[PDB]
Amino acid sequence: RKPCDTMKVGGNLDSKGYGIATPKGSSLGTPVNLAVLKLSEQGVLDKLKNKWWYDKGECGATSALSLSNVAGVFYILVGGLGLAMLVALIEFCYKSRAEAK
Amino acid sequence: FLDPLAYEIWMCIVFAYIGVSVVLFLVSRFSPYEWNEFGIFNSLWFSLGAFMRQGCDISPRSLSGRIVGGVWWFFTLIIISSYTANLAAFLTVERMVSPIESAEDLSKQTEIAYGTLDSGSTKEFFRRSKIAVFDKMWTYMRSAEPSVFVRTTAEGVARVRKSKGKYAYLLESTMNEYIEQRKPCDTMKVGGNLDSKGYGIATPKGSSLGTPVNLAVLKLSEQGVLDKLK
Amino acid sequence: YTANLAAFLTVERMVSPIESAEDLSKQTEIAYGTLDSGSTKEFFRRSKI
Amino acid sequence: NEFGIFNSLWFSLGAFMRQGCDISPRSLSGRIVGGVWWFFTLIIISS
Amino acid sequence: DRGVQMLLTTVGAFAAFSLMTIAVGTDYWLYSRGVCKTEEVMTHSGLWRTCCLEGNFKGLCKQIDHFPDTAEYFLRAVRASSIFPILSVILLFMGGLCIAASEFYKTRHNIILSAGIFFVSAGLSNIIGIIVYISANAGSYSYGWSFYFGALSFIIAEMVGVLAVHMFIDRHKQLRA
Amino acid sequence: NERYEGYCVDLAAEIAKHCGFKYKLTIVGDGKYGARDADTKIWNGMVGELVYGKADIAIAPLTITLVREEVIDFSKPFMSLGISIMIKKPQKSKPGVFS
Ligand SMILES: O=c1[nH]c2cc(C(F)(F)F)c(N3CCOCC3)cc2n(CP(=O)(O)O)c1=O
Ligand SMILES: CCCCCCCC/C=C\CCCCCCCC(=O)OC[C@H](O)CO
Ligand SMILES: CCCCCCCC/C=C\CCCCCCCC(=O)OC[C@H](O)CO
Ligand SMILES: CCCCCCCCCCCCCCCC(=O)O
Ligand SMILES: CCCCCCCCCCCCCCCC(=O)O
């Protein structure tokens, strides 16, 4: 969920479960138990987990030195090349004007 | 030996080399008022040797040529220092990377084989799955030569240990964890569980032992006996 | 300059993030806590590990 | 001033120790050789 | 020799201009696993349009959003507006005009020097553009033929600038001789 | 029924379809899960709704504990879980232009 700034890192510490409760002597208990096992085998539970945790999720799912690390030196280099060209041209214009008109 | 710097740095080093050589040549030779041993070929040689921290044999004498030379010298110093430093870091601390860390990863790539036991719940889970990733895994494995399927868990571990990193074996988590901690510790378990299953205590179709053993197992779990025993 | 850059990159390369629980027990830079009162709190309190 | 065998050996040795040159090649072939040896030297000494 | 050189510089100028214009236009700069419209699938991130390939709805193209420290904002601006690739294209065009106008007004030889300066400046703009592009991307993938067209444009621009300055030098050598 | 949505909603729908019986989802008034007050021995929350016949089934994320398994019947777990650590994302730092 947004802003997607957290992360689950370590596997589970303990192990528990969630279940479908029912009254201590309700006839629904056995059929619901078998329904849960049938769903678990059929993968419906896994699909529902995916759908409600990931499909509705608001997000998706080297050691070398990167150009970002040395970008400033490139900027400086090209800046200096530009400055050099400018200085050359200024001197050349000045010399052209310098000749007795 | 190129690993200390990214491919982009090498590419931009080559671009900057050509740029510097050309600008040095231009700025040294264009003015008719100068007419410098700095033709295009000599400019390229100057730049190359400046980068490799070798001699000069000529140095620009004008202001503009000197600006170009100075910035190229600064650039060279930083880039070479950075190369040496990063190589030192690489050779000091070795960081081995696991090629796969998830099921979808095994699905997406194809460089490393993987397969389940010949017949079992491990096979069926894939044989009869409607989930994107497991469907893809089934499509791959159904036709994999040679047979990605082994005859026994012992065979599976032996095969994964034989192949350098080509084969990955899918098995139950508990057996995997057991194997991992044993000698020669050649293998590891990656990612999470693909599905969920449980181990339990059986009991005959009807008896008074079941009801109390359920309470016993929950009590053991809650107290922390089972975690400590595991 | 070169030696300090190497030190920078080597240190940054040997930085291991958190990977397990006992890794929280060993260190003290990353504080950790649970809910005010609930099952996890009790789990820790009565913990025999 | 020109690359005989002895001067060739001296140039190479000095290039390896990063100890600058009294003379460097002027031809295309000499410059190819020099440049490649400079690359080799840079990588090996850094390593 | 001479006579060939003018044709060669003209051809080179046209080749560099065409390559750079195509590169700015097309969208095969980066092959990445992004999202086509708004799962993962391979894309065609260009300077402007990230577009979907090898998917259920390949061929769908969407405008890249370059935004959600001052350096980050300024880099995002400079990369969103491909100012440096565009400036490269404009300078190459002006250099082409200078070369074309060389045939007329031949008397004045400082128009061809202008051509040389424009081509070299085009190369420098191209380098800065590549650096900002890559840097902005950095804040598996691959580079497509558009990127390499930009690179080749840079190389040819720098060669053509060298040739332009060479012929300017020859012209003043003849004039003084 | 149509007013609600969630993992438990879909689970309840599927369970009903397997067993074949209509149902009416109803939230717990108190807003708790389950607890036996030591003095009164009262069950609040959905465990209350189960023990005192106020409901017929709970399809919530209800933990399978011992104090709870005694007074009600739990199906085999439909979702296994545990305690886990959550930390800020790595947040890879962009190197400065002049780093
Ligand atoms: O049976 C129980 N099942 C629970 C199921 C969940 C959830 F995972 F959200 F579904 C939660 N969440 C934990 C965070 O605060 C409330 C929501 C609490 C539960 N509690 C209370 P506990 O005492 O803290 O375990 C129970 O008792
Ligand atoms: C006589 C001939 C003269 C030759 C002249 C050419 C030599 C240029 C050399 C190096 C320039 C290095 C430029 C350094 C710029 C760094 C500025 C900087 O970034 O400082 C602010 C910082 O980012 C805040 O965090
Ligand atoms: C002016 C005349 C000068 C003459 C020229 C002198 C030589 C230049 C120096 C070094 C060449 C280095 C060549 C680098 C070769 C790179 C090989 C490479 O890149 O292959 C790796 C592969 O891409 C990974 O998958
Ligand atoms: C003075 C300028 C020349 C310096 C020598 C640079 C030569 C290396 C260029 C190699 C290109 C990049 C390829 C290696 C990166 C990779 O594939 O991993
Ligand atoms: C002065 C030396 C010139 C350098 C020669 C470079 C030769 C090797 C180039 C390799 C390019 C590999 C392409 C990378 C593919 C990609 O990820 O886009």
Author numbering:
A (entry chain C): 715 to 775, 784 to 823
B (entry chain B): 517 to 551, 569 to 763
C (entry chain C): 616 to 664
D (entry chain A): 569 to 615
E (entry chain G): 5 to 42, 55 to 84, 92 to 162, 173 to 210
F (entry chain C): 418 to 516
Publication text:
AMPA glutamate receptors (AMPARs), the primary mediators of excitatory neurotransmission in the brain, are either GluA2 subunit-containing and thus Ca2+-impermeable, or GluA2-lacking and Ca2+-permeable. AMPA glutamate receptors (AMPARs) mediate rapid signalling throughout the brain, and orchestrate various forms of synaptic plasticity that underlie learning. These cation channels assemble in various combinations from four core subunits, GluA1–4, with each contributing unique gating kinetics, trafficking and subsynaptic localization. AMPARs exhibit a modular architecture with a two-layer extracellular region connected to the transmembrane ion channel (transmembrane domain, TMD). The ion channel is encircled by diverse auxiliary subunits, modulating receptor gating kinetics, pharmacology and ion flux, with the transmembrane AMPAR regulatory proteins (TARPs γ2, γ3, γ4, γ5, γ7, γ8) being the most abundant.
A GluA2 mutant (F231A) increasing NTD dynamics phenocopies this behaviour, and exhibits reduced synaptic responses, reflecting the anchoring function of the AMPAR NTD at the synapse. The Phe231 to alanine mutation, which destabilizes this interface, slowed desensitization recovery of GluA2(F231A), both in the absence and presence of TARPs (γ2 and γ3). To probe the relationship between NTD stability and gating further, we determined a cryo-EM structure of resting-state GluA2(F231A) fused to TARP γ2 (GluA2(F231A)/γ2; edited at the R/G site), a receptor combination permitting comparison with existing GluA2/γ2 structures. Contrary to these, GluA2(F231A)/γ2 exhibited splayed NTD dimers, reminiscent of GluA1, although the conformational space of GluA2(F231A)/γ2 appeared narrower. Nevertheless, the tetrameric B/D interface was lost throughout 3D classes, highlighting a central role of the GluA2-specific Phe231 in establishing the canonical AMPAR Y-shape, and the impact of this arrangement on desensitization recovery. As in GluA1, we obtain particles (about 10%) without domain swap between NTD and LBD, drawing a further link between NTD B/D interface stability and domain swapping. As the NTDs form tight dimers in the nanomolar range, the domain swap (and its reversal) probably involves the LBD dimers, which are substantially more flexible.
